[PDB]
Design an enzyme around this catalytic site. Sequence first.
Site, short mmCIF file in Angstrom:
data_model
loop_
_atom_site.label_atom_id
_atom_site.label_comp_id
_atom_site.label_asym_id
_atom_site.label_seq_id
_atom_site.Cartn_x
_atom_site.Cartn_y
_atom_site.Cartn_z
N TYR A 27 0.75 -1.26 0.00
CA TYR A 27 0.00 0.00 0.00
C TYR A 27 0.78 1.31 0.00
O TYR A 27 0.21 2.36 -0.28
CB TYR A 27 -1.00 0.01 1.17
CG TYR A 27 -2.12 -0.98 0.97
CD1 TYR A 27 -1.95 -2.32 1.29
CD2 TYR A 27 -3.31 -0.58 0.38
CE1 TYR A 27 -2.96 -3.26 1.03
CE2 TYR A 27 -4.32 -1.50 0.11
CZ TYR A 27 -4.14 -2.84 0.44
OH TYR A 27 -5.14 -3.74 0.15
N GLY A 29 2.54 3.90 -1.69
CA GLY A 29 2.86 4.32 -3.05
C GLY A 29 1.65 4.26 -4.03
O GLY A 29 0.71 5.05 -3.94
N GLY A 31 -1.25 2.58 -4.80
CA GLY A 31 -2.66 2.32 -4.89
C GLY A 31 -2.81 1.20 -3.92
O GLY A 31 -2.58 1.43 -2.73
N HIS A 47 -3.78 5.11 5.67
CA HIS A 47 -3.61 6.42 5.04
C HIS A 47 -4.44 6.50 3.75
O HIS A 47 -5.10 7.51 3.49
CB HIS A 47 -2.13 6.65 4.74
CG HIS A 47 -1.84 8.04 4.25
ND1 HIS A 47 -1.47 8.31 2.96
CD2 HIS A 47 -1.89 9.23 4.89
CE1 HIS A 47 -1.30 9.61 2.82
NE2 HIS A 47 -1.55 10.20 3.97
N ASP A 48 -4.39 5.44 2.95
CA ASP A 48 -5.16 5.38 1.71
C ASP A 48 -6.65 5.46 2.06
O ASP A 48 -7.42 6.15 1.38
CB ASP A 48 -4.88 4.06 0.97
CG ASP A 48 -3.56 4.06 0.21
OD1 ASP A 48 -2.80 5.05 0.29
OD2 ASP A 48 -3.28 3.05 -0.47
N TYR A 51 -7.65 8.97 2.92
CA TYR A 51 -7.84 9.78 1.72
C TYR A 51 -9.17 9.39 1.08
O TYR A 51 -9.86 10.22 0.50
CB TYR A 51 -6.71 9.51 0.70
CG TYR A 51 -5.44 10.32 0.91
CD1 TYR A 51 -5.32 11.20 1.98
CD2 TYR A 51 -4.37 10.22 0.02
CE1 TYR A 51 -4.17 11.97 2.17
CE2 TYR A 51 -3.21 10.98 0.19
CZ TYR A 51 -3.12 11.85 1.27
OH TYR A 51 -1.98 12.60 1.46
N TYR A 64 -1.43 22.42 2.41
CA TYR A 64 -1.92 22.87 3.71
C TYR A 64 -0.73 23.36 4.51
O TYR A 64 0.42 23.22 4.09
CB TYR A 64 -2.63 21.73 4.46
CG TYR A 64 -1.81 20.47 4.62
CD1 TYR A 64 -0.81 20.37 5.59
CD2 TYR A 64 -2.04 19.36 3.80
CE1 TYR A 64 -0.06 19.20 5.73
CE2 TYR A 64 -1.30 18.19 3.93
CZ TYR A 64 -0.31 18.12 4.89
OH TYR A 64 0.44 16.96 4.99
N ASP A 89 -2.41 12.85 6.89
CA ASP A 89 -0.95 12.79 6.75
C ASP A 89 -0.24 12.75 8.10
O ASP A 89 0.73 12.02 8.28
CB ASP A 89 -0.44 13.98 5.95
CG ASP A 89 -0.80 13.90 4.48
OD1 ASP A 89 -1.39 12.89 4.05
OD2 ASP A 89 -0.47 14.86 3.75
O1 LIG Z 1 2.19 9.96 -6.43
C1 LIG Z 1 2.22 9.21 -5.22
O2 LIG Z 1 1.16 8.22 -5.22
C2 LIG Z 1 3.57 8.51 -5.06
C3 LIG Z 1 4.82 9.42 -5.04
C4 LIG Z 1 5.06 10.08 -3.68
C5 LIG Z 1 5.48 11.41 -3.49
N1 LIG Z 1 5.61 11.71 -2.16
C6 LIG Z 1 5.32 10.66 -1.38
C7 LIG Z 1 5.30 10.45 0.02
C8 LIG Z 1 4.93 9.17 0.54
C9 LIG Z 1 4.57 8.08 -0.32
C10 LIG Z 1 4.57 8.24 -1.73
C11 LIG Z 1 4.94 9.51 -2.29
#
Ligand SMILES: O=C(O)CCc1c[nH]c2ccccc12
Length: 121
Positions: A27, A29, A31, A47-48, A51, A64, A89
Amino acid sequence: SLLEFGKMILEETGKLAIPSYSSYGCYCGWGGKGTPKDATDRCCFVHDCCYGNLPDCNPKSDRYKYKRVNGAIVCEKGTSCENRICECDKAAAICFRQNLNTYSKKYMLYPDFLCKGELKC
Ligand SMILES: O=C(O)CCc1c[nH]c2ccccc12
């Protein structure tokens, strides 16, 4: 936005968001699918999901403001989307810090086909 999130992660863990957390597990990065590999991967899953509760917000690009009150992360007042993105975050950065001891490099660049399973938010 990713700019704030990355800075938050480095301040908190000492590790650079990219490469350390952009291709970790299932997870962090890309998706996400399958079962989180470990505690750090679970931080990314949550975290996903966080969002995911903000359909009409744009987490990656909306900026922010946040400050440090003796180490503590404090999200400053902005639009409603910005406030909620910051809280998502902040939560992840702390979760990462909390699980630094089990961070494992064998999960870096983890292949997609090994992410099997179901996990609903
Ligand atoms: O575009 C994102 O989905 C991945 C690239 C990316 C930039 N800053 C990040 C900080 C934490 C995890 C992933 C990222």
